[PDB]
Symmetry: D2
Subunit: 267 residues, 4 copies
C-alpha cells in the first residue's frame, strides 16, 4: 500500500463506521473510565473490540459482556501490563490471532506520581515514566509492526493536559514529563509511520471516573475555579474524540493532539 | 460557575446527531470546498443548515437545493460579507428569524496573500487582516450575543496550519498572522464564553479544493515532499472535525485547536 | 555582500556589545516602562539609541538626556504613531538620515483592552488590532526595507504572554489576539527575511511598569497567586532579553519567542 | 520571600556578571561543543566553572587549562555519567565541597538514536530515554536539593529542537521523545521549585560542534535547505543564551524555552 490514502467515503457516517474493523483499548477495565468509553463508542460504530485489564479481569469480563449485549459485536478481554514489552507483544499477537487483524489501537498508561522530584525517590520517578512513557512506547512498538505489514492502522495515544502544563497545587513532574513525551511520541511516529499508519494524541483535563470522592473538597474547588467550564468532564465526553481518530473521519489527520480539558489550558 | 454541562447522551450517535438544531456555514458557495463539506456533514447529522456567500449568488443556491434533496433537512442561502460587521449582524438577525435559532456557527474566511510584507503594500496587509481576522471576529461577536441568550452554542473557527508555521516557498505573512490570531481568538473566547458557549479551531493544511491548476506543479511537489502523507487533503476529510466540534460529541472541549495537515507540522 | 552568517565574535562580551551600532526603541518615553529599560540596556552596551514617543515629547527628551549623560552615548527622540504606516516609514528615514543606519529595531505597541468581545465594540476591537497588531506590522515593514538594503538587521518585537494564554479574570480578547498575531509575525518574518535579518519576539508577563495603583489589590493578589514567582516582574528584568536579541549574542536565533512571565504560563 | 525575588542590579553588565558564583556544565570535554562554550561564556562573566566528562578526562583537562588561562578563574573537571543517579549525586556533593556552592547548573544529556521505533530494539529506546531524559532528571534532582537549601539557583536544561518537531529524514523518535520530556521537565520543575530557583531550557537546532558522524552529503544539503538561515549553527552562538538563563539578567524568566535553530521550527 504505497502510503496512506484519503477515505473513499463521501458519507460522514461511513467515515465514522468501524464495521469490519478491529480496535484494541488498553484501558476498558472499569465502569466509567476513559478506556471503556473508548471501547463503547468504537462498538457503537460496529467494530469488534478487544479490551485489556492489568491484573484483575473481572471488571474487564463484565465490560465485554456489556459491549456484546448492548452493541451486538464481537468483543474479548486480554491481559496487558503496558510496562512489559513482552506482555504488549503477546497482546498484539493474541488479538491478531483471534480477530484476524488490528485496525486501530488506543493505548492508555495511567500510573500517577505522588510528589515532586525532590521529595520523590529515583525508583518512583523511573516508575511513572516506565509505565506512562515506556508503557505507551511498548504499545506503539508492538502494534506498529502489525500496522506496517498491513499497510494501514490508526494509533491513538492517551496523553494528558499535564503534558502541556503542570498541575497545581499537586506536584507530579514525573507524570507531566511522561505525558509530554507521549504527546511528542505521537508527532514523531506520525512521521516515522507516514507510509502506513496515523498517530494522534488526546490530552484530557480533569476527568471523573468515579473516584472524585477521594479528593478534598478544597482541592476540587481550587481546580474547578481554574477550569472555565467549572466542572470535571466525563469519560463519555471523550468517546467522540477516540472514535474520531480510530476511524476514517480523520484520514488526513496525523500527528495531531486534541486537548479535552474544559478549557483549562486556555489560561 | 458552574457554566456549561456535559451531554445528556450516553450514545455517541445521539451526541453527533444535530437533529433539532441549527448550524450556519460561511463561504460554502462552492462545489468541493471546506465550507460546503462542513454543511454536508452537519446536514447528514440531520440539521437545518444556513450557508452564506460573498458575491455572485451562484454556487450557493445549487448547494441549498442539493443539501435539502440528499439530506431532507431545511436549508437557505444568505449573502454575507464577513469583513463587514453589519453584514454578519444582519446574517445572524435573519437566520434567527427563518430558523428560530443558531446552535452552532462555523466561521470561515480564506482571503489570501500573494506576497511578503516588504513586497506587499499596506493595503494588501489590511485586506487580508480585515477579512481573515476581523471577519472571524465579526462572526464570533455577532453570534456570541445570540448564544449568550440561549445559554448554549458552539462556534468553530476554521483557522489554518499557517497560523502555526510560515509556508514555504510562498511568502504570505499577512495570511499567516491572521490565522494565528484566529487560533488564539478561539482560545480567548473559550475562556470569555465559559458560561454559555464552547469555541474551537480547526487548522487545515494543504487541502485540494479543485484549484491546484492555478498553482505550479513544481510548487506542489515541494509541498508534497514536506507533507508526511505525501499528498493534499480533501475537504471531505474535514467534515468529521467540523461535526465533531459543532455537536454534543465534544461538550468538554473548549479552547482547543485540531491540525489536519497530513502531518505537515510534525517536522 | 554575503548573507546571514554566525557572529565573527568568540568572546561573549564582544557579541553582546552594540558599540558602533544603532538601535531604535519605540516604547520608551517615560522614566519607567519596557521601552526605557530596553534603551538603557542597549546604551550600556555602547549603542547609539533612538527612542520614540506617541506624543508629550518632554518625557522622551528627558530620557534622551539621561541615556547620553549616564552611558555617554549619542541618542535622540522622534515621534511615531505606530498605527500610521507613513509615520513609521518617516521614523526610519529620519533615524538613518541622522544616525546613518539601523542595526536593531525593538517595536512596542502599547494599546490596552478593557473588556471582552461581547461588551466591547467593533471600534474598540479595531483600535487595539490597528495599534497593537498593525502597528507592529508597520514597524517591521518600515525597518524591513532598510534591513534589506544593508543585508543585516535584528528586529525584536515585544509581544506578551497574552498571546499565549487568556488573562484571568479581566477580559481582553482583542489584546490577547493581537499579541498572538505578533508572536507568529516574528516567526513568519524570520523566514521571509532569511537572507538578511533576524526576527524574534518577547512575551512578557505581568510587568510593574508603574500603573499597579489603578488595578484593585484584590485583583493583584489573584494574579500573584497564579504566578509561581508570586510577584510582578520589573522592567529591569526585560533589558537582559532585549540586548540578547538585538546583539550578536544571538546570530543563530531567529523566529523564536522568549517568555518572561515568572512561570505564569507554566500552569 | 514571595517565591523568587528580582535582581537587585539595574546594570545589565552587573546582572550578567557571575563573580562570586559557581556554575557547572555537564559535558564540556570537547573543543567546540555546546557545553564548553557554555563554560567559557560563564567563565568570561567571572564564574568559577566546573565541567564534567563521561570519560574524556584528558579533554576536560585541556578545557580547564584554557578556562583558567584566558579568564583567570577557578575551574575543576569532574567525571559524571548522567544515566547514573549516584554519579550526579556525587557530582554535586563534590563540587559543593571544592567550590563551597553551586549557583547555576547546566545539564546537557545528548546521546543519539540512529533509528526509528520499528527497526530499533527495546533496549535502544530505553538507553536514549535513560540518558537523555532520566539523565537530565538526575542532574535536576541531585542539584535541586542543594538549591532549595540556599533558596537560590538556576538550572539550564539543554533540550533540543527535536523536542518540538521530528527530524527528517533521519528517524530518531526515542531521541525526540526524550527531548520533549526535557522541555516540559523545565516548565514543571520551574513551578515545583518556584520558591528557590528558576528553570529554563534551550532547544538548539543543528550545531557543528566537532563531530556529526557519517551522514551522506546529500542529506546534509537537505537539512540546510530546511534551515532558513541555510547553515548549521555554532556552539559559540549558544553561549549568550546559557549565560542569559544562568545569571541575574533573567530574574523573572522561569519555565521558558528558547529555540536556537536558525529558524528551522519556523516552517
Ligand atoms: Na515545522
Ligand atoms: Na496556564
Amino acid at each position: 500500500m504505497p502510503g496512506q490514502q484519503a477515505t473513499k467515503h463521501e458519507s460522514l457516517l461511513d467515515q465514522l463506521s468501524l464495521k469490519g474493523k478491529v480496535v484494541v483499548v488498553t484501558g476498558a477495565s472499569g465502569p466509567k473510565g476513559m478506556g471503556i468509553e473508548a471501547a463503547r463508542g468504537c462498538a457503537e460504530m460496529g467494530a469488534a473490540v478487544a479490551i485489556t485489564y492489568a491484573s484483575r479481569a473481572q471488571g474487564a469480563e463484565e465490560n465485554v459482556k456489556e459491549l456484546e449485549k448492548t452493541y451486538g459485536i464481537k468483543a474479548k478481554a486480554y491481559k496487558c501490563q503496558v510496562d512489559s514489552y513482552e506482555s504488549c507483544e503477546k497482546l498484539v499477537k493474541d488479538v491478531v490471532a483471534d480477530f484476524g487483524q488490528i485496525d486501530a489501537f488506543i493505548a492508555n498508561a495511567g500510573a500517577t506520581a505522588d510528589s515532586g522530584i525532590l521529595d520523590g525517590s529515583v525508583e518512583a520517578w523511573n516508575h511513572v515514566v516506565q509505565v506512562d512513557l515506556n508503557g505507551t512506547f511498548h504499545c506503539a512498538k508492538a502494534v506498529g509492526h502489525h500496522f506496517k505489514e498491513r499497510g494501514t492502522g490508526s494509533l491513538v495515544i492517551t496523553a494528558s493536559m499535564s503534558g502541556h502544563i503542570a498541575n497545581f497545587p499537586q506536584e507530579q513532574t514525573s507524570y507531566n514529563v511522561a505525558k509530554a513525551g507521549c504527546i511528542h511520541m505521537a508527532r514523531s511516529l506520525a512521521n516515522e509511520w507516514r507510509d502506513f499508519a496515523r498517530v494522534n494524541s488526546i490530552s484530557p483535563g480533569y476527568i471523573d471516573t468515579g473516584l472524585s470522592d477521594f479528593v478534598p473538597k478544597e482541592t476540587q474547588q481550587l481546580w474547578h475555579s481554574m477550569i472555565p467550564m467549572g466542572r470535571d468532564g466525563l469519560a463519555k465526553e471523550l468517546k467522540g474524540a477516540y472514535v474520531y481518530f480510530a476511524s476514517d473521519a480523520s484520514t488526513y489527520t496525523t500527528g495531531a493532539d486534541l486537548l479535552i480539558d474544559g478549557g483549562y489550558t486556555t489560561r
